[PDB]
Ligand binder design. Structure first.
Ligand SMILES: [Zn+2]
Ligand SMILES: [Zn+2]
Ligand SMILES: [Zn+2]
Length: 245
């Protein structure tokens, strides 16, 4: 997602934290002045200005290309060197839960976990290798030149013309998604990436025309918004388990 999508996932999650996780999240955040779960949510996309080395090191962690393999993830094939979102989310969840680390080390892991739970729910972050997750599927969207990846990251969300305070209660007023009975931090990332990939492969998500507009928005913006709500609920359930026991 773009930055607004990341912040909305965090804002949905923040309100669903249990008291234990609330307290520990606030304590980790307070080690960095002005940090909130929302403000840190875009951080992993913004590393070029102040931590370009980490940005280079972690750029592959934002996606996994499994649509060629019918949305059946295999770590050795799809995640060489741990360089994909499934293995990165698993590792950063472990690091976040390691109370023996410094606050700085745990906060960095929190920033990755918040971002990556968002990205692993963006269908085009779990799509085809051969068109770079839709980046090479060129579109005109209300006449603007774009691509299917960007359309899902921000194009459709931008059509609401809402700030976070207007968009958040829209997401919260949706029907509640049915979550797993418990967080499994090491198994859930694969489940989520495969679910996202299956959306990318649904008939119509790749549109029949390159010229699209309101018809596509009216059909699929609700699904993008459902995915933001689902990501936020999944992020809260994960933080409640890792930080809230
Ligand atoms: Zn994103
Ligand atoms: Zn993206
Ligand atoms: Zn990202």
């Amino acid at each position: 997602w773009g930055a607004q999508g990341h912040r909305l996932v965090a804002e949905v999650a923040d309100a669903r934290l249990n008291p234990t996780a609330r307290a520990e999240v606030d304590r980790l955040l307070a080690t960095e002045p002005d940090a909130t779960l929302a403000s840190i949510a875009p951080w992993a996309d913004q590393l070029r200005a102040k931590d370009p080395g980490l940005g280079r090191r972690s750029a592959g962690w934002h996606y996994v290309n499994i649509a060629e393999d019918n949305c059946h993830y295999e770590a050795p094939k799809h995640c060489r060197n741990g360089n994909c979102i499934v293995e990165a989310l698993k590792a950063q969840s472990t690091i976040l839960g390691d109370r023996s680390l410094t606050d700085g080390e745990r906060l960095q892991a929190l920033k990755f976990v918040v971002h990556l739970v968002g990205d692993i729910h963006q269908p085009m972050h779990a799509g085809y290798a051969h068109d770079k997750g839709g980046n090479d599927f060129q579109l005109q969207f209300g006449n603007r030149g774009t691509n299917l990846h960007s359309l899902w990251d921000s194009g459709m969300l931008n059509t609401r013309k809402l700030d976070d305070a207007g968009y958040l209660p829209l997401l919260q007023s949706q029907r509640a998604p049915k979550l797993a009975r418990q967080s499994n931090p090491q198994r859930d990332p694969q489940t989520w990436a495969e679910a996202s990939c299956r959306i990318s492969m649904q008939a119509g998500v790749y549109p029949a025309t390159r010229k699209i507009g309101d018809e596509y928005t009216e059909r699929y913006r609700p699904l993008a918004e459902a995915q933001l709500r689902l990501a936020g609920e999944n992020l809260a359930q994960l933080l409640n388990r890792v930080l809230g026991a």
